[PDB]
């Protein structure tokens, strides 16, 4: 807390030296729409995985499968922390997220030995849950990595079913303000390009765009 100054060496250009060395150029980056309100994997940095997003099953589908279950629509819990689970979703099986990339590599007999329930067939419907729908989304990506044709995700599984207020506790790794990053300590590039990459135009909380080239606008004046 208390507004720690950060140990990065970014700086705005002064009022004395000319603007030079335009084979790198920082400018302010402003996109069209806000993405911070959206789901975490519906944001801007995950757009390329947009076709990898699992189809959504909703609350009413989950209540209908609670009341009237199907033999091959497998409800699977993807929550990892055993200290944060307090209730049982009906007709659910426990396959925690951090083991999924190993779990689908097993045979059916090894799946039965290492989890106590049968391995789902690749044509069976699989429905995944988590606290917010984040561990279930990564698990759905791991389930779609293998050739599983029908994989669905209930976004906000436990927190809407049981009414809890929990989270999957995703870190989203951001450097500590004592950790000095790469381009300050290094002779990987020449001194002009090193000074021109480390400069920015404005405060260092917003996003910027780095230009690899620039030509002078001779047609203005």
CA distance 66 to 45: 35
Footprint on residues 194-213 left by other proteins (CB under 8 A)? 202-205, 209, 211-213
Footprint on residues 30-89 left by other proteins (CB under 8 A)? 30-33, 44, 47-48, 50, 57-61, 64
The DSSP-derived string for 66-96 is HHS--TTEEEEE----TTS--S--TTEEE--
Helix then strand then coil, in percent of the chain rounded to 5, is: 25, 15, 60
What is the smallest separation between the CB atom of 169 and other proteins, expressed in angstroms? Answer: 27
Closer of 34 and 147 to other proteins (Cβ): 34
Question: Residue 69: how many CA atoms within 13 Å on its side-chain side?
Answer: 12
Site string for other proteins, 150-189 (x = CB under 8 A): -----------------------------------xxxxx
Q: Which two tokens stand for residue 82?
A: 């055993």
Binding stretches for other proteins (CB under 8 A)? 3, 5, 10-12, 14-23, 27-33, 44, 47-48, 50, 57-61, 64, 185-190, 192, 202-205, 209, 211-221
């Amino acid at each position: 807390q208390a507004d720690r100054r950060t140990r990065h060496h970014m700086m705005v250009d002064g009022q004395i030296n000319p603007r030079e060395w335009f084979n790198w150029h920082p400018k302010e980056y402003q996109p069209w729409y806000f993405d911070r309100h959206k789901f975490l994997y519906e944001q801007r940095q995950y757009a390329q995985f947009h076709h990898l997003l699992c189809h959504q099953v909703y609350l009413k589908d989950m209540l209908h499968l609670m009341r009237y279950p199907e033999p091959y629509t497998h409800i699977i819990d993807c929550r990892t922390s055993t200290q944060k689970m307090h209730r049982w979703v009906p007709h659910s099986l426990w396959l925690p997220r951090d083991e999924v990339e190993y779990a689908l590599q097993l045979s059916a007999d090894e799946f039965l030995d290492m989890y106590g329930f049968r391995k789902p067939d690749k044509s069976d419907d699989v429905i995944l849950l988590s606290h917010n729908g984040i561990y279930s989304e990564q698990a759905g990506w791991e389930w779609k990595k293998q050739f599983f044709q029908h994989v669905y995700n209930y976004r906000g599984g436990t927190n809407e079913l049981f009414g809890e207020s929990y989270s999957d506790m995703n870190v989203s790794d951001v450097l500590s303000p004592w950790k000095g990053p790469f381009p300050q300590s290094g002779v990987f590039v020449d001194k002009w390009s090193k000074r021109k990459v480390l400069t920015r135009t404005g405060p260092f909380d917003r996003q910027y765009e780095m230009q690899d080239f620039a030509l002078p606008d001779l047609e203005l004046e």
